[PDB]
Design a protein around this ligand. Structure first.
Ligand SMILES: CC(=O)O[C@H]1C(=O)[C@@]2(C)[C@H]([C@H](OC(=O)c3ccccc3)[C@]3(O)C[C@H](OC(=O)[C@H](O)[C@@H](NC(=O)c4ccccc4)c4ccccc4)C(C)=C1C3(C)C)[C@]1(OC(C)=O)CO[C@@H]1C[C@@H]2O
Ligand SMILES: Nc1nc2c(ncn2[C@@H]2O[C@H](COP(=O)(O)OP(=O)(O)OP(=O)(O)O)[C@@H](O)[C@H]2O)c(=O)[nH]1
Ligand SMILES: Nc1ncnc2c1ncn2[C@@H]1O[C@H](COP(=O)(O)OP(=O)(O)NP(=O)(O)O)[C@@H](O)[C@H]1O
Ligand SMILES: Nc1nc2c(ncn2[C@@H]2O[C@H](COP(=O)(O)OP(=O)(O)O)[C@@H](O)[C@H]2O)c(=O)[nH]1
Ligand SMILES: [Mg+2]
Lengths: 433, 451, 292, 150
């Protein structure tokens, strides 16, 4: 029994968590009231991964919602899936951080962290055999970045053998909805590099690009982006819940994807995408899934994988398919694009197959890539961060909450080392000198 | 609970408060008598938003406002107007003379004996709030009361509460048109206190509003009511983030964290893009890109200064109505590629975005057309220094001969304050000059693995 | 910068009381710079063999030929490294071994103070050389600190307070360091002995099948060394500063040897991770030295 | 671990393996070689006779002989099951010449450390192609030595 505890902090994390729970509830046939009205038998076989059982055959998820302003909690409660959650898990304060990292991690969050940790311990002790945690949040904001990093630190200190994940929305190159974003992104990445086993990098720009170009939507909204991210999140942990011909837990993905401890920043992806009104033209087969999956324009990280090399790749398929087709297609992808795969790993494509595909898709697949191109994101942040730190743009708001300038420098150094470490395994030969 | 306290000092302050409270009662469906029939008909709701209004047991709603002025006439008007029953009868009006366009009279001589009552009533209002956000102070530079009394108030509130944000809306003397002879003195004097004690002072000129009204609204004879209505619309746009749901909400702390680089630079400009008459409301799309572009134009600026002569340090955009994020994204991308808009090299990001679902309302008897989309821009830039520099010259021309100085000294002030003041205004301009310069060269870029 | 000249040495100790009591047999044989070892259960195939830069035979105590005397190993390592230290550059000693092999011995020496390990010879030459060299136109300063690494957490030994975790940091110019790490000055080697004993009493130790007392954590004994000059001029300046790091490594661990569960396996896992990282960096430094 | 404990406890009884070795080209894991190399010691010391198979070879056999272009693990497992049944058939049913499990070991391993034989099954043929052919004894014996059928 592999139980996952789900946490979500900040406006972005709360919205994504709401959409994710709506999706998973559809997958397992749970009504908004909490009762079960499904059709197949396998849906209840592993419901205990995400849900707890109440008295009258009613199920309640393991969500824990955190914020420092009551607006988003009120929005989520007054919603289609408001009443499914447990009331005692809605932890919140007032007078939120306000895009200020110091308020979130050193001043305001220090009061709410004890209550949040108490609820987390209560929920965790009741599980049969906890596997890992989750956390949805955004790095460009105060409450999200600050409280999320603090929670990650404390939980990692308390439970050191379980698997910590996180789905983080990085700042975008061009589209910007805050001005003090680089400070929050840097002072945070500094903690995520230390206290996490896997991080999946999401960016608004890539998701907007997918919606505008692939799905052909004329008016994308945040619901769609949450949809995409939620589809990926559901796809990642499929093998814990349903049977298959080759299983892969979170820990197997962790072992196979990460060569060294500090290189765990992944580019996620999902296929297929017919954009509607074009399903009749596209024939759905395993080669088509593999073709769309590796395309540079399908990624949600806003990094071009052609500018680097793939350290490792993982593909989780969901459906009824032949194993020979999967193995041959992965071999062909490796051979035809040999320039973009590192040479000192003889084979760097993990594969898994599950038997139960999604609601209305004969077949589906999800992608977890690990390549050096992700370094560009960090580099871009540094190229902004120093530009604001040489002349101390907005620093007094941070030092007013008790944070010595040294903390800022101790970080720009850490991220710069991360970029350098990735840059080492990037050149496509190493000899002579 | 997101509450905030409104203060109105001086004649300009109380007329702006009149327009403001008219607008807010219209937004919340509250009758001028204080009753709300919407809840009675529906049977219950959150329409009695606790931000501006406190709800009593009988169902009446009283505003979280404190009017103050030394002239009984301007508030005897509202004690016998339409909204006579909306306000609590304790209004804190002095039955004496006025500052008479004298900072010294309003600060030292007559400012006492009325200060105490104002702090007790502000204390009583503050005690009723749970998680107060801050103060919105309305007043006008140049007036004796609105300068001196506002300075004394600002000092006492800073001493007492301290950590609460205290925003300010003010009316600056225009370059050319003026209504008094001693405006520069009272300005140069209250700048010293508005620099230290305020946290973010919004700045508005009358001539800019006259030009905006003449050009866009096609009103050839505007009066103070239209100006107050525009200012009220701006304040509504600022505060709507913590009254209605939205996709991206912007609280009052985010304002200051995102718009104030250094502690002494907190003087942004304000603009409202879709200002247009009902007749011209047709024949136009009023898409998001159009209003976003119209915000940046020099003509629509609400203070008589050219943005093209400075550099933008920060921008806050606050949208209302049918707005989706992708249109704002595209508009920002389009603005960033224009060369006439220069951003400083130490702010690569530049922008803050906030979206609200509640569209703007239309006041009966007004002039603004009903629109589906609206936006308010708050830009922190270096051009503002020019608007200061002009006034200073006049004060020096007034000071070199020591004209009209015996009136100020007779009320209890000394000459060195006039002197000390000029120095303070003199520096602030220096700081605004330094922040606008580009980075030097970095002082680096050395060789390395040359082997 | 200087070439990463790493010196690899191995040393064989004699028998202990328990081994002498049993009918044990010696299996390590040395020749030149090569050491070979055999299997008692597999005596047919071949001995395994290794080569190191230094092989030291302190097996036979009364032996006169090719005996690795403590003064000999000190001449090999400590004298040259103290000479390097006095040039103003940093020095590091790593002591490794498993309960019995004989680590402490090489680091400290016997209790009768007749055959001295690395620490007394180094410290006494440092103190004595200075005491018989300092003049009016120079000043010397020496300080000592002592910390331990346990489960990737830094703990202080000299300070007797509640053993809370400390927080590593990174001063931009001076590099990594630890906050609130007690630092004390010393005058002679008796002071260092007192501080070393006091700190060694505070180290975490647990019993296992191999031994009743086994190191569960690494230790670092840092000696801060500063030289100041008084030239014939009003400008008095510090010539340079150097650090000597004497480091005790916990032995490699295998559940095929420590069958304890719970915290004991976790400590062994963290120890093995740290050892692997240390070997990874050390080999890379030697490659860096070798290439150009 | 299990083979170690069984060798200690029982000792003299035979122990056979049927294992899937990694394929030269295709694989479903990145850390496979470490596991295989670490396993080879216990495969060597304790087991008495180990047979190896490869998924790539069986895929090729299925494609060429049975004309299944998209096989799955079920077909491979069925083939391996046929192999094991033919191995153990001599213990169950009557025959002219019977071969016990110990006879395999006596006749097939020369020295203790080279007990790694390959296995093959000759008449793998689809129902449609079952006709047009005699499938005599000589034909199947010849097919067993074909390098393509390994
Ligand atoms: C062919 C058909 O029947 O219609 C599809 C469809 O046209 C496509 C375009 C769907 C459609 O998705 C979108 O339009 C979309 C919009 C914004 C963001 C993301 C997707 C679909 O909505 C999505 C929907 O997918 C599902 O129902 C899956 O089970 C999916 N779950 C959800 O979408 C879901 C959302 C909220 C609540 C509950 C479920 C899923 C996939 C993997 C793992 C878990 C769940 C399906 C089949 C389709 C429509 C309806 C058009 C796609 O989405 C998924 C996840 O299947 C977009 O890319 C795929 C490819 C499909 O062909
Ligand atoms: N925009 C706008 N400005 C106003 C309004 N009423 C007054 N003012 C400004 O206020 C200035 C006069 O100073 P006041 O603020 O009225 O000073 P006061 O309130 O009369 O206080 P005393 O001078 O002591 O009597 C004029 O120059 C106007 O520009 C108004 O209704 N709208
Ligand atoms: N080369 C040597 N010559 C003589 N005696 C030695 C020698 N090496 C060790 N000894 C002694 O023999 C014993 C073995 O050292 P011991 O204190 O058991 O070290 P250890 O337990 O191997 N240290 P560690 O590896 O850190 O756990 C001690 O009494 C030493 O003084
Ligand atoms: N993908 C996604 N991103 C969002 C959403 N809402 C906000 N964001 C991003 O989050 C950033 C602001 O983070 P915010 O939610 O305010 O952080 P918080 O205040 O600590 O909760 C913006 O730059 C947005 O790009 C959403 O619904 N989906
Ligand atoms: Mg007046």
């Amino acid at each position: 029994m592999r139980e996952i505890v789900h946490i979500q902090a900040g406006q972005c994390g709360n919205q994504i968590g709401a959409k994710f729970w709506e999706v998973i509830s559809d997958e397992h046939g749970i009504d908004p009231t909490g009762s079960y009205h499904g059709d197949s038998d396998l849906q209840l076989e592993r419901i205990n991964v995400y849900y707890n059982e109440a008295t009258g055959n009613k199920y309640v998820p393991r969500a824990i919602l955190v914020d420092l302003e009551p607006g988003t909690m009120d929005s989520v409660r007054s919603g289609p899936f408001g009443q499914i959650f447990r009331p005692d898990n809605f932890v919140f304060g007032q007078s939120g951080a306000g895009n200020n990292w110091a308020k979130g991690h050193y001043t305001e969050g220090a009061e709410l962290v004890d209550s949040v940790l108490d609820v987390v311990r209560k929920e965790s002790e009741s599980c049969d055999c906890l596997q890992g945690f989750q956390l949805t949040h955004s790095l460009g904001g105060g409450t999200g970045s600050g409280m999320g990093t603090l929670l990650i630190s404390k939980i990692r200190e308390e439970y050191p053998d379980r698997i910590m994940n996180t789905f983080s929305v990085m700042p975008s190159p061009k589209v910007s909805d805050t001005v003090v974003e680089p400070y929050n992104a840097t002072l945070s990445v500094h903690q995520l590099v230390e206290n996490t086993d896997e991080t999946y990098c999401i960016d608004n720009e890539a998701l907007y690009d997918i919606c505008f170009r692939t799905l052909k939507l004329t008016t994308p909204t945040y619901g769609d982006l949450n949809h995409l991210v939620s589809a990926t999140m559901s796809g990642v942990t499929t093998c814990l819940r349903f049977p298959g011909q080759l299983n892969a837990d979170l820990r197997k993905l962790a072992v196979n994807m990460v060569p060294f401890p500090r290189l765990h920043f992944f580019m996620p992806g999902f296929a297929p995408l017919t954009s509607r009104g074009s399903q009749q033209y596209r024939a759905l087969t395993v080669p088509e899934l593999t073709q769309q999956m590796f395309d540079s324009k399908n990624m949600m990280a806003a990094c071009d994988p052609r500018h680097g090399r793939y350290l490792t790749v993982a593909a989780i398929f969901r459906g009824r398919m032949s194993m020979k087709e999967v193995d041959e297609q992965m071999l062909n992808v490796q051979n035809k694009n040999s320039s973009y795969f590192v040479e000192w790993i003889p084979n760097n494509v993990k594969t898994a197959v599950c038997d139960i595909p999604p609601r209305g898709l004969k077949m589906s697949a999800t992608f977890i890539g690990n390549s050096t191109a992700i370094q560009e994101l960090f580099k871009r942040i540094s190229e902004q961060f120093t530009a604001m730190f040489r002349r101390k743009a907005f620093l007094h708001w941070y030092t007013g909450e008790g944070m010595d300038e040294m903390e800022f420098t101790e970080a720009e150094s850490n991220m710069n080392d991360l970029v350098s470490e990735y840059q080492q395994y990037q050149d496509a030969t190493a000899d002579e000198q | 609970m997101r509450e905030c306290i409104s203060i109105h000092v001086g004649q300009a302050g109380v007329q702006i408060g009149n327009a403001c409270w008219e607008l807010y009662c219209l937004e919340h469906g509250i009758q001028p008598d204080g009753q709300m029939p919407s809840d009675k008909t529906i049977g219950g709701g959150d329409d009695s938003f606790n931000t501006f209004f406190s709800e009593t047991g009988a169902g009446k709603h009283v505003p979280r406002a404190v009017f103050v002025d030394l002239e009984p006439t301007v508030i005897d008007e509202v004690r016998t107007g339409t909204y006579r029953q909306l306000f609590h009868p304790e209004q804190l009006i002095t039955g004496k003379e006025d500052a008479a366009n004298n900072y010294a009279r309003g600060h030292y001589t007559i400012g006492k004996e009325i200060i105490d009552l104002v702090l007790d009533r502000i204390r009583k209002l503050a005690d009723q709030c749970t998680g107060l956000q801050g103060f919105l102070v309305f007043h006008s530079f140049g007036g004796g009361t609105g300068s001196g009394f506002t300075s004394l108030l600002m000092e006492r509130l800073s001493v007492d509460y301290g950590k609460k944000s205290k925003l300010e809306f003010s009316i600056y003397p225009a370059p050319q048109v003026s209504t008094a002879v001693v405006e520069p003195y009272n300005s140069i004097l209250t700048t010293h206190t508005t620099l230290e004690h305020s946290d973010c002072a919004f700045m508005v000129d009358n001539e800019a509003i006259y030009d905006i009204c003449r050009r866009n609204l096609d009103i050839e004879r505007p009066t103070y009511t239209n100006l107050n209505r525009l200012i009220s619309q701006i304040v509504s746009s600022i505060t709507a983030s913590l009254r209605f749901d939205g996709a991206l909400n912007v609280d009052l702390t985010e304002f200051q964290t995102n718009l104030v680089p250094y502690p002494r630079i907190h003087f942004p400009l304000a603009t409202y893009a879709p200002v247009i008459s009902a007749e011209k409301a047709y024949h136009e799309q009023l898409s998001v890109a159009e209003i976003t572009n119209a915000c940046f134009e020099p003509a629509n600026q609400m203070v008589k200064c050219d943005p093209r002569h400075g550099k933008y340090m920060a921008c806050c955009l606050l949208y209302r109505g049918d707005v989706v994020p992708k249109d704002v994204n595209a508009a920002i991308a389009t603005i960033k590629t224009k060369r006439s808009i220069q951003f400083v090299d130490w702010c690569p990001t530049g922008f803050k975005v906030g979206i609200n679902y509640q569209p703007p309302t239309v006041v009966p008897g007004g002039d603004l057309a009903k629109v589906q989309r609206a936006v308010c821009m708050l830009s922190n830039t270096t051009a503002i220094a020019e608007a200061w520099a002009r006034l200073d010259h006049k004060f020096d021309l007034m000071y070199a001969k020591r004209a009209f100085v015996h009136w100020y000294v007779g009320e209890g002030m000394e000459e060195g304050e006039f002197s000390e003041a000029r120095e303070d205004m003199a520096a602030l301009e220096k700081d605004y000059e330094e922040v606008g310069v580009d980075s030097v060269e970095g002082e680096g870029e050395e060789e390395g693995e040359e082997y | 910068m200087a070439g990463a000249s790493v010196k690899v040495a191995v040393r064989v100790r004699p028998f202990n009381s328990r081994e002498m009591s049993r009918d044990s047999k010696c299996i390590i044989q040395m020749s030149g710079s090569t050491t070979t070892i055999v299997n008692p259960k597999q005596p047919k195939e071949t001995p395994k063999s290794f080569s190191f830069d230094y092989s030291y035979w302190s097996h036979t105590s009364p032996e006169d030929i090719n005996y690795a005397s403590q003064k000999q190993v000190y001449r090999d390592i400590g004298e040259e490294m103290l000479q390097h230290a006095f040039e103003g550059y940093n020095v590091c000693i790593f002591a490794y071994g498993q309960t019995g092999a004989g680590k402490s011995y090489t680091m400290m020496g016997k209790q009768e103070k007749d055959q001295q390990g690395i620490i007394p010879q180094l410290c006494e030459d440092l103190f004595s050389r200075i005491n018989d060299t300092t003049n009016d136109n120079m000043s010397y300063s020496v300080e000592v600190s002592y910390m331990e690494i346990y489960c990737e957490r830094v703990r202080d030994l000299l300070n007797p307070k509640n053993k809370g975790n400390l927080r590593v940091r990174e001063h931009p110019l001076l590099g990594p360091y630890v906050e609130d790490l007690s630092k004390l000055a010393v005058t002679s080697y008796n002071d260092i002995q007192d501080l070393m004993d006091s700190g060694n009493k505070a180290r975490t130790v647990a019993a296992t099948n191999m031994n009743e007392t086994s190191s569960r954590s690494h230790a670092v004994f840092n000696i801060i060394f500063t030289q100041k000059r008084h030239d014939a001029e009003t400008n008095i300046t510090t010539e340079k500063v150097s650090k000597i790091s004497l480091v005790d490594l916990a032995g490699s661990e295998r559940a095929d040897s420590t069958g304890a569960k719970g915290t004991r396996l976790k400590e062994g896992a963290n120890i093995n991770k740290s050892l692997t990282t240390l070997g990874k960096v050390i080999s890379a430094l030697a490659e860096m030295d070798s290439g150009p």
